[PDB]
mmCIF file with all atom_site columns, all heavy atoms in Angstrom:
data_model
loop_
_atom_site.group_PDB
_atom_site.id
_atom_site.type_symbol
_atom_site.label_atom_id
_atom_site.label_alt_id
_atom_site.label_comp_id
_atom_site.label_asym_id
_atom_site.label_entity_id
_atom_site.label_seq_id
_atom_site.pdbx_PDB_ins_code
_atom_site.Cartn_x
_atom_site.Cartn_y
_atom_site.Cartn_z
_atom_site.occupancy
_atom_site.B_iso_or_equiv
_atom_site.pdbx_formal_charge
_atom_site.auth_seq_id
_atom_site.auth_comp_id
_atom_site.auth_asym_id
_atom_site.auth_atom_id
_atom_site.pdbx_PDB_model_num
ATOM 1   N N   . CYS A 1 1  ? 8.853   4.303  -8.375 1.00 0.00 ? 1  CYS A N   1
ATOM 2   C CA  . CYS A 1 1  ? 9.435   5.444  -7.665 1.00 0.00 ? 1  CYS A CA  1
ATOM 3   C C   . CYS A 1 1  ? 8.439   6.245  -6.934 1.00 0.00 ? 1  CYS A C   1
ATOM 4   O O   . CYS A 1 1  ? 8.581   6.613  -5.743 1.00 0.00 ? 1  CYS A O   1
ATOM 5   C CB  . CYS A 1 1  ? 10.240  6.342  -8.637 1.00 0.00 ? 1  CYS A CB  1
ATOM 6   S SG  . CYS A 1 1  ? 11.117  7.682  -7.852 1.00 0.00 ? 1  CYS A SG  1
ATOM 7   N N   . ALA A 1 2  ? 7.317   6.649  -7.610 1.00 0.00 ? 2  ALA A N   1
ATOM 8   C CA  . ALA A 1 2  ? 6.235   7.377  -6.932 1.00 0.00 ? 2  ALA A CA  1
ATOM 9   C C   . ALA A 1 2  ? 5.590   6.614  -5.827 1.00 0.00 ? 2  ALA A C   1
ATOM 10  O O   . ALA A 1 2  ? 5.423   7.189  -4.695 1.00 0.00 ? 2  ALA A O   1
ATOM 11  C CB  . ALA A 1 2  ? 5.228   7.861  -7.997 1.00 0.00 ? 2  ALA A CB  1
ATOM 12  N N   . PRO A 1 3  ? 5.219   5.335  -5.966 1.00 0.00 ? 3  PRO A N   1
ATOM 13  C CA  . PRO A 1 3  ? 4.522   4.625  -4.863 1.00 0.00 ? 3  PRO A CA  1
ATOM 14  C C   . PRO A 1 3  ? 5.473   3.798  -3.992 1.00 0.00 ? 3  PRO A C   1
ATOM 15  O O   . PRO A 1 3  ? 4.984   3.104  -3.105 1.00 0.00 ? 3  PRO A O   1
ATOM 16  C CB  . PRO A 1 3  ? 3.560   3.740  -5.582 1.00 0.00 ? 3  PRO A CB  1
ATOM 17  C CG  . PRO A 1 3  ? 4.212   3.401  -6.869 1.00 0.00 ? 3  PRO A CG  1
ATOM 18  C CD  . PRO A 1 3  ? 5.209   4.521  -7.199 1.00 0.00 ? 3  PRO A CD  1
ATOM 19  N N   . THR A 1 4  ? 6.775   3.830  -4.216 1.00 0.00 ? 4  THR A N   1
ATOM 20  C CA  . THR A 1 4  ? 7.647   3.002  -3.354 1.00 0.00 ? 4  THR A CA  1
ATOM 21  C C   . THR A 1 4  ? 7.670   3.598  -1.951 1.00 0.00 ? 4  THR A C   1
ATOM 22  O O   . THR A 1 4  ? 7.664   2.846  -0.956 1.00 0.00 ? 4  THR A O   1
ATOM 23  C CB  . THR A 1 4  ? 9.099   2.920  -3.947 1.00 0.00 ? 4  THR A CB  1
ATOM 24  O OG1 . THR A 1 4  ? 9.897   2.115  -3.128 1.00 0.00 ? 4  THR A OG1 1
ATOM 25  C CG2 . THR A 1 4  ? 9.720   4.298  -4.144 1.00 0.00 ? 4  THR A CG2 1
ATOM 26  N N   . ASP A 1 5  ? 7.768   4.928  -1.806 1.00 0.00 ? 5  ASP A N   1
ATOM 27  C CA  . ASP A 1 5  ? 7.694   5.619  -0.524 1.00 0.00 ? 5  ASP A CA  1
ATOM 28  C C   . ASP A 1 5  ? 6.292   6.173  -0.304 1.00 0.00 ? 5  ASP A C   1
ATOM 29  O O   . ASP A 1 5  ? 6.079   7.361  -0.201 1.00 0.00 ? 5  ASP A O   1
ATOM 30  C CB  . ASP A 1 5  ? 8.767   6.688  -0.412 1.00 0.00 ? 5  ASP A CB  1
ATOM 31  N N   . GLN A 1 6  ? 5.322   5.249  -0.275 1.00 0.00 ? 6  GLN A N   1
ATOM 32  C CA  . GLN A 1 6  ? 3.952   5.656  -0.085 1.00 0.00 ? 6  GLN A CA  1
ATOM 33  C C   . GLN A 1 6  ? 3.306   5.172  1.174  1.00 0.00 ? 6  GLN A C   1
ATOM 34  O O   . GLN A 1 6  ? 2.718   5.958  1.934  1.00 0.00 ? 6  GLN A O   1
ATOM 35  C CB  . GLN A 1 6  ? 3.108   5.078  -1.261 1.00 0.00 ? 6  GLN A CB  1
ATOM 36  N N   . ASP A 1 7  ? 3.483   3.899  1.524  1.00 0.00 ? 7  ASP A N   1
ATOM 37  C CA  . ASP A 1 7  ? 2.913   3.319  2.728  1.00 0.00 ? 7  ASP A CA  1
ATOM 38  C C   . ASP A 1 7  ? 3.524   1.956  2.916  1.00 0.00 ? 7  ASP A C   1
ATOM 39  O O   . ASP A 1 7  ? 3.600   1.153  2.018  1.00 0.00 ? 7  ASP A O   1
ATOM 40  C CB  . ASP A 1 7  ? 1.362   3.193  2.633  1.00 0.00 ? 7  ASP A CB  1
ATOM 41  C CG  . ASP A 1 7  ? 0.716   2.787  3.937  1.00 0.00 ? 7  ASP A CG  1
ATOM 42  O OD1 . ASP A 1 7  ? 1.367   2.110  4.786  1.00 0.00 ? 7  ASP A OD1 1
ATOM 43  O OD2 . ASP A 1 7  ? -0.481  3.107  4.136  1.00 0.00 ? 7  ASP A OD2 1
ATOM 44  N N   . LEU A 1 8  ? 4.010   1.689  4.162  1.00 0.00 ? 8  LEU A N   1
ATOM 45  C CA  . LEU A 1 8  ? 4.689   0.439  4.520  1.00 0.00 ? 8  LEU A CA  1
ATOM 46  C C   . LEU A 1 8  ? 5.746   0.087  3.443  1.00 0.00 ? 8  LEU A C   1
ATOM 47  O O   . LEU A 1 8  ? 5.634   -0.900 2.738  1.00 0.00 ? 8  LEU A O   1
ATOM 48  C CB  . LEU A 1 8  ? 3.635   -0.683 4.661  1.00 0.00 ? 8  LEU A CB  1
ATOM 49  N N   . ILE A 1 9  ? 6.772   0.967  3.460  1.00 0.00 ? 9  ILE A N   1
ATOM 50  C CA  . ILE A 1 9  ? 7.778   0.896  2.335  1.00 0.00 ? 9  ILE A CA  1
ATOM 51  C C   . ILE A 1 9  ? 8.213   -0.518 2.054  1.00 0.00 ? 9  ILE A C   1
ATOM 52  O O   . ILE A 1 9  ? 8.108   -0.964 0.937  1.00 0.00 ? 9  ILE A O   1
ATOM 53  C CB  . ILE A 1 9  ? 8.960   1.799  2.706  1.00 0.00 ? 9  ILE A CB  1
ATOM 54  C CG1 . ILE A 1 9  ? 8.536   3.268  2.828  1.00 0.00 ? 9  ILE A CG1 1
ATOM 55  C CG2 . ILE A 1 9  ? 10.053  1.649  1.661  1.00 0.00 ? 9  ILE A CG2 1
ATOM 56  C CD1 . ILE A 1 9  ? 8.077   3.683  4.239  1.00 0.00 ? 9  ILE A CD1 1
ATOM 57  N N   . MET A 1 10 ? 8.644   -1.257 3.096  1.00 0.00 ? 10 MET A N   1
ATOM 58  C CA  . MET A 1 10 ? 8.808   -2.703 2.987  1.00 0.00 ? 10 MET A CA  1
ATOM 59  C C   . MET A 1 10 ? 8.252   -3.289 4.257  1.00 0.00 ? 10 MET A C   1
ATOM 60  O O   . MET A 1 10 ? 8.961   -3.588 5.236  1.00 0.00 ? 10 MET A O   1
ATOM 61  C CB  . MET A 1 10 ? 10.270  -3.087 2.749  1.00 0.00 ? 10 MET A CB  1
ATOM 62  N N   . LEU A 1 11 ? 6.939   -3.524 4.250  1.00 0.00 ? 11 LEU A N   1
ATOM 63  C CA  . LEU A 1 11 ? 6.215   -4.165 5.377  1.00 0.00 ? 11 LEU A CA  1
ATOM 64  C C   . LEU A 1 11 ? 5.174   -5.132 4.944  1.00 0.00 ? 11 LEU A C   1
ATOM 65  O O   . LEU A 1 11 ? 4.802   -6.007 5.723  1.00 0.00 ? 11 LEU A O   1
ATOM 66  C CB  . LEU A 1 11 ? 5.574   -3.133 6.279  1.00 0.00 ? 11 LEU A CB  1
ATOM 67  C CG  . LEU A 1 11 ? 6.394   -2.404 7.340  1.00 0.00 ? 11 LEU A CG  1
ATOM 68  C CD1 . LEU A 1 11 ? 7.218   -1.223 6.711  1.00 0.00 ? 11 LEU A CD1 1
ATOM 69  C CD2 . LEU A 1 11 ? 5.524   -1.865 8.495  1.00 0.00 ? 11 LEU A CD2 1
ATOM 70  N N   . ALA A 1 12 ? 4.695   -5.063 3.723  1.00 0.00 ? 12 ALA A N   1
ATOM 71  C CA  . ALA A 1 12 ? 3.577   -5.887 3.170  1.00 0.00 ? 12 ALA A CA  1
ATOM 72  C C   . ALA A 1 12 ? 2.288   -5.685 3.861  1.00 0.00 ? 12 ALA A C   1
ATOM 73  O O   . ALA A 1 12 ? 1.293   -6.347 3.627  1.00 0.00 ? 12 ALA A O   1
ATOM 74  C CB  . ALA A 1 12 ? 3.942   -7.359 3.136  1.00 0.00 ? 12 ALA A CB  1
ATOM 75  N N   . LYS A 1 13 ? 2.232   -4.736 4.832  1.00 0.00 ? 13 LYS A N   1
ATOM 76  C CA  . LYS A 1 13 ? 0.967   -4.439 5.512  1.00 0.00 ? 13 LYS A CA  1
ATOM 77  C C   . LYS A 1 13 ? -0.026  -3.670 4.691  1.00 0.00 ? 13 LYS A C   1
ATOM 78  O O   . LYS A 1 13 ? -1.184  -3.539 5.095  1.00 0.00 ? 13 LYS A O   1
ATOM 79  C CB  . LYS A 1 13 ? 1.262   -3.659 6.831  1.00 0.00 ? 13 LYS A CB  1
ATOM 80  N N   . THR A 1 14 ? 0.404   -3.148 3.527  1.00 0.00 ? 14 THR A N   1
ATOM 81  C CA  . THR A 1 14 ? -0.505  -2.426 2.656  1.00 0.00 ? 14 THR A CA  1
ATOM 82  C C   . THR A 1 14 ? -1.413  -3.287 1.847  1.00 0.00 ? 14 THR A C   1
ATOM 83  O O   . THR A 1 14 ? -2.309  -2.752 1.211  1.00 0.00 ? 14 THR A O   1
ATOM 84  C CB  . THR A 1 14 ? 0.273   -1.501 1.740  1.00 0.00 ? 14 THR A CB  1
ATOM 85  O OG1 . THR A 1 14 ? 1.353   -2.266 1.118  1.00 0.00 ? 14 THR A OG1 1
ATOM 86  C CG2 . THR A 1 14 ? 0.887   -0.347 2.530  1.00 0.00 ? 14 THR A CG2 1
ATOM 87  N N   . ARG A 1 15 ? -1.177  -4.589 1.817  1.00 0.00 ? 15 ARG A N   1
ATOM 88  C CA  . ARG A 1 15 ? -2.007  -5.462 1.008  1.00 0.00 ? 15 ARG A CA  1
ATOM 89  C C   . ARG A 1 15 ? -3.445  -5.418 1.479  1.00 0.00 ? 15 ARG A C   1
ATOM 90  O O   . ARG A 1 15 ? -4.371  -5.302 0.636  1.00 0.00 ? 15 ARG A O   1
ATOM 91  C CB  . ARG A 1 15 ? -1.465  -6.912 1.043  1.00 0.00 ? 15 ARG A CB  1
ATOM 92  N N   . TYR A 1 16 ? -3.667  -5.533 2.745  1.00 0.00 ? 16 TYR A N   1
ATOM 93  C CA  . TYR A 1 16 ? -5.031  -5.519 3.286  1.00 0.00 ? 16 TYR A CA  1
ATOM 94  C C   . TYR A 1 16 ? -5.718  -4.140 2.998  1.00 0.00 ? 16 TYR A C   1
ATOM 95  O O   . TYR A 1 16 ? -6.893  -4.089 2.591  1.00 0.00 ? 16 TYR A O   1
ATOM 96  C CB  . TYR A 1 16 ? -5.038  -5.761 4.796  1.00 0.00 ? 16 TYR A CB  1
ATOM 97  N N   . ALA A 1 17 ? -4.985  -3.028 3.235  1.00 0.00 ? 17 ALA A N   1
ATOM 98  C CA  . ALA A 1 17 ? -5.564  -1.733 2.966  1.00 0.00 ? 17 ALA A CA  1
ATOM 99  C C   . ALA A 1 17 ? -5.929  -1.535 1.497  1.00 0.00 ? 17 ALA A C   1
ATOM 100 O O   . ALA A 1 17 ? -6.930  -0.977 1.151  1.00 0.00 ? 17 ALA A O   1
ATOM 101 C CB  . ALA A 1 17 ? -4.595  -0.632 3.465  1.00 0.00 ? 17 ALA A CB  1
ATOM 102 N N   . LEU A 1 18 ? -5.001  -1.966 0.606  1.00 0.00 ? 18 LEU A N   1
ATOM 103 C CA  . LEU A 1 18 ? -5.256  -1.821 -0.823 1.00 0.00 ? 18 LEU A CA  1
ATOM 104 C C   . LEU A 1 18 ? -6.458  -2.687 -1.257 1.00 0.00 ? 18 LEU A C   1
ATOM 105 O O   . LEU A 1 18 ? -7.264  -2.245 -2.063 1.00 0.00 ? 18 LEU A O   1
ATOM 106 C CB  . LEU A 1 18 ? -4.012  -2.202 -1.621 1.00 0.00 ? 18 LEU A CB  1
ATOM 107 N N   . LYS A 1 19 ? -6.541  -3.907 -0.722 1.00 0.00 ? 19 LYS A N   1
ATOM 108 C CA  . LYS A 1 19 ? -7.689  -4.740 -1.065 1.00 0.00 ? 19 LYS A CA  1
ATOM 109 C C   . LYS A 1 19 ? -8.982  -4.152 -0.556 1.00 0.00 ? 19 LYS A C   1
ATOM 110 O O   . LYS A 1 19 ? -10.010 -4.185 -1.276 1.00 0.00 ? 19 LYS A O   1
ATOM 111 C CB  . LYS A 1 19 ? -7.484  -6.157 -0.475 1.00 0.00 ? 19 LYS A CB  1
ATOM 112 N N   . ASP A 1 20 ? -8.984  -3.576 0.649  1.00 0.00 ? 20 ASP A N   1
ATOM 113 C CA  . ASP A 1 20 ? -10.193 -2.936 1.170  1.00 0.00 ? 20 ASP A CA  1
ATOM 114 C C   . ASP A 1 20 ? -10.579 -1.715 0.340  1.00 0.00 ? 20 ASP A C   1
ATOM 115 O O   . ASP A 1 20 ? -11.774 -1.507 0.101  1.00 0.00 ? 20 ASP A O   1
ATOM 116 C CB  . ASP A 1 20 ? -9.959  -2.545 2.609  1.00 0.00 ? 20 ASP A CB  1
ATOM 117 N N   . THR A 1 21 ? -9.581  -0.905 -0.033 1.00 0.00 ? 21 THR A N   1
ATOM 118 C CA  . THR A 1 21 ? -9.861  0.294  -0.804 1.00 0.00 ? 21 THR A CA  1
ATOM 119 C C   . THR A 1 21 ? -10.203 0.002  -2.263 1.00 0.00 ? 21 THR A C   1
ATOM 120 O O   . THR A 1 21 ? -10.814 0.894  -2.918 1.00 0.00 ? 21 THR A O   1
ATOM 121 C CB  . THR A 1 21 ? -8.656  1.256  -0.739 1.00 0.00 ? 21 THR A CB  1
ATOM 122 O OG1 . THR A 1 21 ? -7.474  0.555  -1.162 1.00 0.00 ? 21 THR A OG1 1
ATOM 123 C CG2 . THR A 1 21 ? -8.490  1.764  0.667  1.00 0.00 ? 21 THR A CG2 1
ATOM 124 N N   . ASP A 1 22 ? -9.829  -1.133 -2.804 1.00 0.00 ? 22 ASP A N   1
ATOM 125 C CA  . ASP A 1 22 ? -10.119 -1.461 -4.179 1.00 0.00 ? 22 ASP A CA  1
ATOM 126 C C   . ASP A 1 22 ? -11.559 -1.899 -4.412 1.00 0.00 ? 22 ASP A C   1
ATOM 127 O O   . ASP A 1 22 ? -11.872 -2.983 -4.740 1.00 0.00 ? 22 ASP A O   1
ATOM 128 C CB  . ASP A 1 22 ? -9.167  -2.572 -4.652 1.00 0.00 ? 22 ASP A CB  1
ATOM 129 N N   . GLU A 1 23 ? -12.528 -0.953 -4.165 1.00 0.00 ? 23 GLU A N   1
ATOM 130 C CA  . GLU A 1 23 ? -13.931 -1.174 -4.335 1.00 0.00 ? 23 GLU A CA  1
ATOM 131 C C   . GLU A 1 23 ? -14.602 -0.079 -5.129 1.00 0.00 ? 23 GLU A C   1
ATOM 132 O O   . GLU A 1 23 ? -15.810 0.104  -5.019 1.00 0.00 ? 23 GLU A O   1
ATOM 133 C CB  . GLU A 1 23 ? -14.613 -1.335 -2.958 1.00 0.00 ? 23 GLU A CB  1
ATOM 134 N N   . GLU A 1 24 ? -13.780 0.649  -5.975 1.00 0.00 ? 24 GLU A N   1
ATOM 135 C CA  . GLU A 1 24 ? -14.302 1.781  -6.720 1.00 0.00 ? 24 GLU A CA  1
ATOM 136 C C   . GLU A 1 24 ? -14.948 2.809  -5.791 1.00 0.00 ? 24 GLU A C   1
ATOM 137 O O   . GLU A 1 24 ? -15.967 3.408  -6.161 1.00 0.00 ? 24 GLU A O   1
ATOM 138 C CB  . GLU A 1 24 ? -15.242 1.311  -7.843 1.00 0.00 ? 24 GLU A CB  1
#
């Protein structure tokens, strides 16, 4: 519920951004 309306609600475009940001 909290992250469902966060970014690209249903687009799958957030995978690249999340992978890039997942570097501590």
Side-chain angles (χ1 to χ4, degrees), residues 1-4 7 9 11-12 14 17 21:
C1 186
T4 182
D7 188 334
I9 297 89
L11 280 79
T14 49
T21 53

